[PDB]
Coordinates of C-alpha atoms and ligand atoms in Angstrom, one line a residue:
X1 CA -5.2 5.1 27.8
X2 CA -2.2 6.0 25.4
X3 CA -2.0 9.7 24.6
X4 CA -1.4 9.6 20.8
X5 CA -2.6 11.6 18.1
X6 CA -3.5 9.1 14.6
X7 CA -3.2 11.4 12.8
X8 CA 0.7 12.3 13.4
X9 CA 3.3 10.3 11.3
X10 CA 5.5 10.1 14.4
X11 CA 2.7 7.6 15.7
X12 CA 3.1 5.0 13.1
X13 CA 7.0 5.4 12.6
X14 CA 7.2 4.6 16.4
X15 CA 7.5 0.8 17.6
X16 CA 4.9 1.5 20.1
X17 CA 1.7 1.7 18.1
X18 CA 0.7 -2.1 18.3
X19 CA 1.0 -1.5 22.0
X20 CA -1.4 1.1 21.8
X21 CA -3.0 -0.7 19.2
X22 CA -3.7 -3.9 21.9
X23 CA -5.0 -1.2 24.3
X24 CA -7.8 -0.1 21.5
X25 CA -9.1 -3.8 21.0
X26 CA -9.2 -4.6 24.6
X27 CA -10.9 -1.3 26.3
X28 CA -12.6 0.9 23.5
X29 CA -12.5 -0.7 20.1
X30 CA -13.9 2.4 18.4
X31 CA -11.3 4.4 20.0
X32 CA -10.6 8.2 20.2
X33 CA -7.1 9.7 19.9
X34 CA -6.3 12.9 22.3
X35 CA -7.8 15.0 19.4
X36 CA -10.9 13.1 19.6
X37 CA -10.4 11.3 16.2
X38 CA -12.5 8.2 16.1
X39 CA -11.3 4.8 14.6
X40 CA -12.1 1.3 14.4
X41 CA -9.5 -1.1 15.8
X42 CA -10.9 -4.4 16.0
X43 CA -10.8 -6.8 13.2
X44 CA -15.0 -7.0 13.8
X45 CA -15.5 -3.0 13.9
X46 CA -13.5 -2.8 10.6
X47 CA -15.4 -5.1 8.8
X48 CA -18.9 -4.0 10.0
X49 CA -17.8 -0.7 8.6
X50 CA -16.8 -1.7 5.7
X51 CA -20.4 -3.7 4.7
X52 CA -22.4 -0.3 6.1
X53 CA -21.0 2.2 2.7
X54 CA -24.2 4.0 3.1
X55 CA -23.3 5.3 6.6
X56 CA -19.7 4.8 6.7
X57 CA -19.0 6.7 3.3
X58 CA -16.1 7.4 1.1
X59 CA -17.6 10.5 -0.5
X60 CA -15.8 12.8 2.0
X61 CA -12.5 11.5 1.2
X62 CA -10.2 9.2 2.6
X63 CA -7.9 11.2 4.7
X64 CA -8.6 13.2 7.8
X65 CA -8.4 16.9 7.3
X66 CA -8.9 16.6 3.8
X67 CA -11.9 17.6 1.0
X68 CA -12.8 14.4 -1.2
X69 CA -11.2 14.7 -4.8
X70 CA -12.2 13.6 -7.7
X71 CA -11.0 9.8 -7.7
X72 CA -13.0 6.7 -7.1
X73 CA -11.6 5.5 -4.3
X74 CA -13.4 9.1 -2.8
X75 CA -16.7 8.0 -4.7
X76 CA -19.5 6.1 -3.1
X77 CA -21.8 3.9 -5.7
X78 CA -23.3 3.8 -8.4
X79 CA -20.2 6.4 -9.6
X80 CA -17.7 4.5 -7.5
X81 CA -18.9 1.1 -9.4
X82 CA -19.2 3.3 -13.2
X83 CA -15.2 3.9 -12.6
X84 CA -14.1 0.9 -11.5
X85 CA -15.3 -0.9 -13.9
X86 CA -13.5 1.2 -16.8
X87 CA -10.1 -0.4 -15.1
X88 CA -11.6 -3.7 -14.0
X89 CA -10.3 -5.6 -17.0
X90 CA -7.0 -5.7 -16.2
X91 CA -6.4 -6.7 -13.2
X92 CA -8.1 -10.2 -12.8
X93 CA -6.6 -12.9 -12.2
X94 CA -6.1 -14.0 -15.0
X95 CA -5.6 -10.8 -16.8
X96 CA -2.0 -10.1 -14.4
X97 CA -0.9 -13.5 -15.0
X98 CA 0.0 -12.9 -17.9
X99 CA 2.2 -10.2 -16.8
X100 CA 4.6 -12.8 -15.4
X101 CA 7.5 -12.6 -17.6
X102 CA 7.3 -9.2 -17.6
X103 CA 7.4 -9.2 -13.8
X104 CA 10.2 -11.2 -14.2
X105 CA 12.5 -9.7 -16.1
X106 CA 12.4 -6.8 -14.1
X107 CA 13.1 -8.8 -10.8
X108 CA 16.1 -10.1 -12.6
X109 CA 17.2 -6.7 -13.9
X110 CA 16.8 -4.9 -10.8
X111 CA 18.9 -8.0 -9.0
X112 CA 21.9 -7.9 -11.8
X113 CA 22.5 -4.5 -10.3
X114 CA 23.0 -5.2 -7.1
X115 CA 24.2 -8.7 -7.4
X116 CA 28.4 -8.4 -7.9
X117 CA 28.3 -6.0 -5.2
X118 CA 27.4 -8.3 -2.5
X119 CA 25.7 -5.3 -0.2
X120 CA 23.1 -3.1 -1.3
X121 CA 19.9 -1.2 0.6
X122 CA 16.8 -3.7 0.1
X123 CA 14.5 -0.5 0.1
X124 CA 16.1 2.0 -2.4
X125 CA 17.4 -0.7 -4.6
X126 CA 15.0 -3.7 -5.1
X127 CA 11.6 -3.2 -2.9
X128 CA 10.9 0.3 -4.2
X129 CA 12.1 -0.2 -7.7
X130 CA 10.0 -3.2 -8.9
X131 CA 6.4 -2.1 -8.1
X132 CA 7.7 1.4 -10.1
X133 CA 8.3 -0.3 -12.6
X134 CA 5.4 -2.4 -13.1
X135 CA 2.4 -0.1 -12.9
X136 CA 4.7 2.2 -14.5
X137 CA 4.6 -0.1 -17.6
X138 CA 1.0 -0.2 -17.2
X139 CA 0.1 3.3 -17.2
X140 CA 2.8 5.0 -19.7
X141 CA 5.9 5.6 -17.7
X142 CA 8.7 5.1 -19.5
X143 CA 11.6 3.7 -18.0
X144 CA 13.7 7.0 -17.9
X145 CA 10.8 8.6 -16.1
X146 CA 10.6 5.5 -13.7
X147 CA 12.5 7.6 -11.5
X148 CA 11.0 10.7 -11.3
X149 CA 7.5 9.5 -10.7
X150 CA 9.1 7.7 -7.5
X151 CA 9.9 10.9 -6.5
X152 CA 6.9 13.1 -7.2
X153 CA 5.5 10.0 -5.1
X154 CA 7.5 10.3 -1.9
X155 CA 7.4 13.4 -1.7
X156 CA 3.4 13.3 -2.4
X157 CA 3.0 10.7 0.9
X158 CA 5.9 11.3 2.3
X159 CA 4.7 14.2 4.8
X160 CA 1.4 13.5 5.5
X161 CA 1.1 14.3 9.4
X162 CA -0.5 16.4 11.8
X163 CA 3.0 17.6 12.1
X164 CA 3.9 18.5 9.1
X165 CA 6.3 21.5 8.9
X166 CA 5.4 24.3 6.7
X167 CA 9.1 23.5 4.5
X168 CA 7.5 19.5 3.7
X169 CA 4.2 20.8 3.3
X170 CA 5.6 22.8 0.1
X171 CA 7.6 19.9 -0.9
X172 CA 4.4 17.6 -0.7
X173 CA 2.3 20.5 -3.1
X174 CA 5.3 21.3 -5.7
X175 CA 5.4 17.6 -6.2
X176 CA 1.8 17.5 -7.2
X177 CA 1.8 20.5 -9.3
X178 CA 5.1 18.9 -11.1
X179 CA 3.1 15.5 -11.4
X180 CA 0.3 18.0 -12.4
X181 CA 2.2 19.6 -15.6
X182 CA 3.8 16.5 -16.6
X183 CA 0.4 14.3 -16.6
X184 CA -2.2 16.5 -17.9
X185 CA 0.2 16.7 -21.5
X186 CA 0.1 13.1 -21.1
X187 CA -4.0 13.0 -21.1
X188 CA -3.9 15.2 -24.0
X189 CA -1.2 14.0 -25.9
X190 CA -3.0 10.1 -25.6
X191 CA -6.1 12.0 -27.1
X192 CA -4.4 12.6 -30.3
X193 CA -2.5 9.5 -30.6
X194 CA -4.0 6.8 -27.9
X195 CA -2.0 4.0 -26.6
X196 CA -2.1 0.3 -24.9
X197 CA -1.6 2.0 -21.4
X198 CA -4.0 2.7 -18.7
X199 CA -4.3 6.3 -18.8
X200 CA -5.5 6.2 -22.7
X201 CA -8.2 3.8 -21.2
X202 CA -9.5 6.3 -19.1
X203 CA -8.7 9.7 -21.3
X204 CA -11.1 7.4 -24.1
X205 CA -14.0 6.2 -21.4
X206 CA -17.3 7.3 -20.9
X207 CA -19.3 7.8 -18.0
X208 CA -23.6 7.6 -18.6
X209 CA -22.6 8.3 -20.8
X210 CA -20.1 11.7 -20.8
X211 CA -16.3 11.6 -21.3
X212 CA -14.2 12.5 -17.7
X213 CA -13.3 15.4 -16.8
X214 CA -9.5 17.0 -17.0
X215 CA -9.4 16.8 -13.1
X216 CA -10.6 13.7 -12.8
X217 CA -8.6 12.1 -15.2
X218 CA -5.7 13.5 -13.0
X219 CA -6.6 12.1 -9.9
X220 CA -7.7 9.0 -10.8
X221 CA -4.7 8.4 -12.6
X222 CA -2.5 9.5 -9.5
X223 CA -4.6 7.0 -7.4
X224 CA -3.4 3.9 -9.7
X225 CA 0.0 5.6 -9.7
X226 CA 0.2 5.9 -5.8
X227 CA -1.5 2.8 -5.4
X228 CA 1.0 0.6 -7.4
X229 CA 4.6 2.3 -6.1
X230 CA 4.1 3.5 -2.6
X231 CA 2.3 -0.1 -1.2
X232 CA 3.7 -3.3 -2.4
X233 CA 6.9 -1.4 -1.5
X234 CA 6.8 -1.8 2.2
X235 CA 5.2 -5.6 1.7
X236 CA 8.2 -6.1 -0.2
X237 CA 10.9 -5.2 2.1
X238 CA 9.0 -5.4 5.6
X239 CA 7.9 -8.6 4.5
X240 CA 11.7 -9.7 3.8
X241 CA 13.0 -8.3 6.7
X242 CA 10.6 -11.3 8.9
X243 CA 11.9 -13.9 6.5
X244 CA 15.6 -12.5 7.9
X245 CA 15.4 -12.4 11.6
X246 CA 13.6 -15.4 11.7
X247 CA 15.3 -17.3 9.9
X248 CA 13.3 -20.9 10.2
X249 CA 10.7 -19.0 8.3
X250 CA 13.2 -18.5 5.6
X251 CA 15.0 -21.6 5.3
X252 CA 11.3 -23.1 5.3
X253 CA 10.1 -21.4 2.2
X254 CA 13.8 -22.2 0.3
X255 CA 13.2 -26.0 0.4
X256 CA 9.9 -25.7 -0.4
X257 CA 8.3 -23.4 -3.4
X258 CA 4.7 -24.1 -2.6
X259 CA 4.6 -22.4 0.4
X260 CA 5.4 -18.6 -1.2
X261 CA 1.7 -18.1 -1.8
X262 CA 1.1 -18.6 1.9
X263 CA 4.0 -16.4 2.8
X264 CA 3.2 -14.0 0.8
X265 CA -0.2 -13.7 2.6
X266 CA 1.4 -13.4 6.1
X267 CA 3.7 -10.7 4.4
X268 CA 0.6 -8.7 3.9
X269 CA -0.4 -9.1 6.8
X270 CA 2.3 -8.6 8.8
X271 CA 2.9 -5.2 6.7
X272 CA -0.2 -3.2 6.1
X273 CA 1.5 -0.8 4.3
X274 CA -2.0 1.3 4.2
X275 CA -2.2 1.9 7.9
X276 CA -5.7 3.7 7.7
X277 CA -8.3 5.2 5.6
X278 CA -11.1 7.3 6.5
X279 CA -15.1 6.7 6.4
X280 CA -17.6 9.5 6.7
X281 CA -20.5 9.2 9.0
X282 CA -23.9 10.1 6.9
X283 CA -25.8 10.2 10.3
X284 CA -25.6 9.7 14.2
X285 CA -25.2 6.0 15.5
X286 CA -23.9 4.2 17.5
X287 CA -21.0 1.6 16.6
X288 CA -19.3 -1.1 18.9
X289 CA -19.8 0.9 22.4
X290 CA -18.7 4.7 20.8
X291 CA -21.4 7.4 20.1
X292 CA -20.6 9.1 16.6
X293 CA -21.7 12.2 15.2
X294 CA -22.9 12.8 11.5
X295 CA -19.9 14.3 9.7
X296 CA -17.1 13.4 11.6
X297 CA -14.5 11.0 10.1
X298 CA -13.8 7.9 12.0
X299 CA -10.5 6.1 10.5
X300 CA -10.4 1.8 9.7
X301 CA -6.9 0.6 11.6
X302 CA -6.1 -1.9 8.9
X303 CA -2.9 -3.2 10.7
X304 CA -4.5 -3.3 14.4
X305 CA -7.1 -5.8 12.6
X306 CA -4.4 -7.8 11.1
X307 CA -2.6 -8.1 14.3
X308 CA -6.6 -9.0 16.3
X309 CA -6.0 -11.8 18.9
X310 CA -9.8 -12.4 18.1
X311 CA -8.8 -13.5 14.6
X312 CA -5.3 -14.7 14.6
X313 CA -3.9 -16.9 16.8
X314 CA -0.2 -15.5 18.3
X315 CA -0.3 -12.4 16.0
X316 CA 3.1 -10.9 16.9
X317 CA 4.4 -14.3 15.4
X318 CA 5.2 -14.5 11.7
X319 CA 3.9 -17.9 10.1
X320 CA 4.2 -18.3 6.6
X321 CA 1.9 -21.6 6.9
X322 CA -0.4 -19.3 8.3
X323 CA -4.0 -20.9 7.7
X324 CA -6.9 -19.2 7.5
X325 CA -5.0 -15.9 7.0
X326 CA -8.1 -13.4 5.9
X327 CA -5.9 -10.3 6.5
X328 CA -7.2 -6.6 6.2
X329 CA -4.0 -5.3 4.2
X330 CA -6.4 -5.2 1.1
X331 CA -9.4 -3.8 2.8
X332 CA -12.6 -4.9 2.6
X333 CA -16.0 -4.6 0.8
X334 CA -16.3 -2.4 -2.4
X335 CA -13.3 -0.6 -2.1
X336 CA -11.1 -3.5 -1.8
X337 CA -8.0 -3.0 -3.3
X338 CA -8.4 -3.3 -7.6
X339 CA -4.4 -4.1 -7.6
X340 CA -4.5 -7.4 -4.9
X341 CA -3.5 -9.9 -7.9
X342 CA -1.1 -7.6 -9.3
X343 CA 0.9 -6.8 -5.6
X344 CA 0.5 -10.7 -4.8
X345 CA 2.2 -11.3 -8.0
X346 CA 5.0 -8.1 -7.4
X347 CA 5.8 -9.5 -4.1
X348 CA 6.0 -13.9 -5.2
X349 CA 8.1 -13.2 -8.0
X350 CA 10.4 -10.5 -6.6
X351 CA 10.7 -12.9 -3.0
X352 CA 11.0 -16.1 -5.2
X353 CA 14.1 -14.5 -7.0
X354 CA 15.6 -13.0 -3.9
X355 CA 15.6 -16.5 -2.5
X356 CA 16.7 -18.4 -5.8
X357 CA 19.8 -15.1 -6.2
X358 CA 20.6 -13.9 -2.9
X359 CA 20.4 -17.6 -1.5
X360 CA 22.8 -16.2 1.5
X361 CA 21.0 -13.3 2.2
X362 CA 21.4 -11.7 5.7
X363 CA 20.5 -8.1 7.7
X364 CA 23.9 -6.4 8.1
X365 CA 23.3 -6.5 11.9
X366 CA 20.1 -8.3 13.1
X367 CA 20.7 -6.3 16.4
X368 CA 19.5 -2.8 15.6
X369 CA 16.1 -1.6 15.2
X370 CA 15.3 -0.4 11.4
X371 CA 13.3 3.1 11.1
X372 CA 10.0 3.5 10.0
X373 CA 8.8 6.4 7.9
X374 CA 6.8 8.7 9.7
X375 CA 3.5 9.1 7.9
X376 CA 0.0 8.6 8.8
X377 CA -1.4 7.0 5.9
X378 CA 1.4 4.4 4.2
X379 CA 4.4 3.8 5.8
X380 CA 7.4 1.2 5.8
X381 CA 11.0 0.8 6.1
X382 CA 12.8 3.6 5.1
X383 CA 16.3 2.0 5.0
X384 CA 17.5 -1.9 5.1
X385 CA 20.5 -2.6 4.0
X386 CA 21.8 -6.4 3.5
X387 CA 24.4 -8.5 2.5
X388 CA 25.0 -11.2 0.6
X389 CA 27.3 -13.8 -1.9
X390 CA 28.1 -11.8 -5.0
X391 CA 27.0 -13.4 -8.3
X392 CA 27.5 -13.0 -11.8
X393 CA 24.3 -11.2 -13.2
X394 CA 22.3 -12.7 -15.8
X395 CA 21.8 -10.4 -18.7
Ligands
HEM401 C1 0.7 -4.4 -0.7 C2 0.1 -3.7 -1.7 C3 -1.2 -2.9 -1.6 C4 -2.0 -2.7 -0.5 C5 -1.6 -3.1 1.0 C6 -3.1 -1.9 -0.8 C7 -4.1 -1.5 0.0 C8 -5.3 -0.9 -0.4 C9 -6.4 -0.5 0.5 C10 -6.4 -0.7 2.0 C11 -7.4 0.0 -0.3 C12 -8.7 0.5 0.3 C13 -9.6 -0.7 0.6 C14 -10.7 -0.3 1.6 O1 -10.8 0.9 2.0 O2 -11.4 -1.2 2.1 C15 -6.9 -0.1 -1.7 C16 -7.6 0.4 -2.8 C17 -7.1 0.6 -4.0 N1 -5.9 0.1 -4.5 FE1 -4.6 -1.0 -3.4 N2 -3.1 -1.8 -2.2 C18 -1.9 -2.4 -2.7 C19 -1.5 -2.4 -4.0 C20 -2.1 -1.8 -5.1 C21 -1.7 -1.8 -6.4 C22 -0.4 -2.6 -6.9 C23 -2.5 -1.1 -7.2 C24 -2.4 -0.9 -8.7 C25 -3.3 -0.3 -9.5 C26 -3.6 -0.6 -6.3 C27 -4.7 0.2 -6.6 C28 -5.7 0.5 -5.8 C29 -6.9 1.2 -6.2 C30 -7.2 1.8 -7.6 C31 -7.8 1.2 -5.1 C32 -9.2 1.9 -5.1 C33 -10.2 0.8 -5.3 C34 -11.6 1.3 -5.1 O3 -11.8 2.4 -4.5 O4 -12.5 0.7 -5.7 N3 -3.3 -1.0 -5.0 N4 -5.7 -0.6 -1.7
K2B402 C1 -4.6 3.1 -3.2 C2 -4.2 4.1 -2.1 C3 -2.6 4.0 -1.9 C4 -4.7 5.5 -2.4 C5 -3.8 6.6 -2.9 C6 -4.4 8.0 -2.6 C7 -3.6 9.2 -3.1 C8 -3.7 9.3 -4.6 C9 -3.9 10.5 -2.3 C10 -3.9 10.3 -0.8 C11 -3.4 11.6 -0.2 C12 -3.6 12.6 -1.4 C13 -2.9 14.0 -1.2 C14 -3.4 14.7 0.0 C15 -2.8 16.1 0.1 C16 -3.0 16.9 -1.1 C17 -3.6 18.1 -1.0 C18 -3.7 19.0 -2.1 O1 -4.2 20.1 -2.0 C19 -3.2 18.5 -3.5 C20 -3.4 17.0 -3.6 C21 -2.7 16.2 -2.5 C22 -1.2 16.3 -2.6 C23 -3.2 14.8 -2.5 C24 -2.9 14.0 -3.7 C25 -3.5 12.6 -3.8 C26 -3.1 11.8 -2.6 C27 -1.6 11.4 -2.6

């Protein structure tokens, strides 16, 4: 049995956890860490969680050793369903389609930057960048601020561990207090003059049938925030760095645009950039061979389930062709993820340019092992830097 603890960064920074991971699905597949944290690690364990909201709940939050707060994602229905569907709109299909140019443009712009330099870091200066930017644009960031949000975010998901020191620990609450300030003038200021963006949605909703409250609208516009620049992210450049060491996979998807939707899929799920998220129990019961008590928090392994021999066939190999591919990098069930169309999008467009731009591009040296960030709830590449054929930007 691997001695870890799932709820230290360290664990998921560390090229062993699909190791340990393989151990969970084949000898306890609700497992429990050295702390006694429970979590589902099968692909089967996750999803029957996921279908049972009225024992496995959401209304204690959706981290470990923290209180529920007042965002949907920490709601069970009917409020969970009464909030969602004040954002709903938006993100349809068909609704982020027509973001497309936009998208666009900011793939382009983001590539002009880098692209007469012939070297840049794939992380800092294209896969973090673009997702910014684009739920930025959609909930009042301007572009000066792009920046600064980033920050605020790092440093907000940064340090979540077990073993977080006490010097992070501020960073992580200074951060929020700063986001704090800056976004409750925001909420007023879009009272007195509301605008196209998301967070005048929300400041001008009502909920049977009373307006939200200041804290709420805080959190819940945090969640989209956090949702749209600390995810896609990690798809982005994880996702790139697969194309790059195996390189059949990217010379496969150059001669041959139809495939990206399918790669982009097996991007996902090769990623998981949400490693976990919690479920209270609302009672005793037992689930998949493990006794559970009422009240504890059991945690739902999205990337041991994308990686379930059970479900995919050679998971440790990355197939763009992969078909069926009915990953777990979205979640499942009634939290599943309101920004899937918009990442899918963020991550065709920005990969379709980067093939189309930086035709030649390479890993400086496919040899060494890249670090992951160690954090227990997102996590990706923290560096990758690349090469590639300098080219005149576009304008
Ligand atoms: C690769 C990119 C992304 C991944 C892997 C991801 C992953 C997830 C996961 C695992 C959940 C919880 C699902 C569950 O517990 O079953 C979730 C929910 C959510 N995500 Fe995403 N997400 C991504 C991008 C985005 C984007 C771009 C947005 C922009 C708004 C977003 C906003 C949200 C929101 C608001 C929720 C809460 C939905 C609810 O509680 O009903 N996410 N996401
Ligand atoms: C769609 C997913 C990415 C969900 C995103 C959830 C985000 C908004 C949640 C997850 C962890 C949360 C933080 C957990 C630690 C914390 C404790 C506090 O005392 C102040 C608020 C903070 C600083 C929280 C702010 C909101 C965060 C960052």
């Amino acid at each position: 049995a691997p001695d870890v603890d799932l709820a230290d960064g360290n664990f998921y920074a560390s090229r062993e956890a699909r190791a340990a991971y393989r151990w969970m699905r084949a000898n306890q597949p609700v497992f429990r860490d050295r702390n006694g944290l429970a979590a589902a690690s099968t692909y089967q364990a996750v999803i029957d969680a996921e279908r049972q909201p009225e024992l496995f709940s959401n209304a204690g939050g959706i981290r470990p050793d923290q209180p529920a707060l007042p965002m949907m994602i920490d709601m069970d229905d009917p409020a969970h369903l009464l909030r969602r569907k004040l954002v709903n709109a938006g993100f349809t299909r068909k609704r982020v389609k027509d973001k497309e140019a936009s998208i666009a443009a900011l793939c382009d712009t983001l590539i002009d930057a880098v692209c007469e330099r012939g070297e840049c870091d794939f992380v800092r200066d294209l896969a973090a960048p673009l997702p910014m930017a684009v739920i930025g644009d959609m909930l009042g960031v301007r572009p000066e601020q792009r920046d600064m949000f980033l920050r605020w975010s790092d440093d907000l998901v940064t340090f979540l561990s077990s073993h977080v020191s006490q010097e992070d620990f501020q960073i992580t609450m200074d951060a929020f207090a700063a986001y704090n300030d800056f976004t409750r003038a925001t909420i007023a200021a879009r009272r007195a003059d509301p605008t196209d963006d998301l967070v005048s949605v929300l400041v001008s909703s009502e909920v049977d049938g009373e307006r939200l409250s200041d804290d709420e609208l805080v959190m819940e516009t945090l969640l989209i925030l956090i949702g749209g620049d600390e995810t896609t992210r990690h798809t982005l450049s994880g996702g790139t760095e697969q194309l790059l060491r195996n390189r059949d996979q990217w010379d496969l998807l150059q001669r041959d645009p139809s495939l990206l939707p399918g790669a982009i899929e097996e991007m996902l799920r090769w990623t998981a950039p949400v490693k976990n998220m919690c479920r209270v129990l609302t009672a005793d019961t037992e689930f998949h061979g493990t006794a559970l008590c009422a009240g504890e928090k059991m945690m739902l392994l999205f990337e041991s389930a994308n990686f379930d021999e059970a479900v995919f066939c050679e998971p440790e190999k990355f197939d763009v062709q992969r078909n069926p591919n009915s990953h777990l990098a979205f979640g499942f069930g009634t939290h599943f993820c309101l920004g899937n169309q918009l990442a899918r999008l963020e991550l065709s467009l920005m990969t379709e340019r980067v093939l189309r731009r930086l035709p030649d591009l390479r890993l400086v040296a496919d040899d060494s092992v890249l670090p992951l960030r160690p954090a227990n709830f997102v996590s990706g590449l923290e560096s990758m830097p690349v090469v590639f054929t300098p080219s005149p930007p576009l304008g």
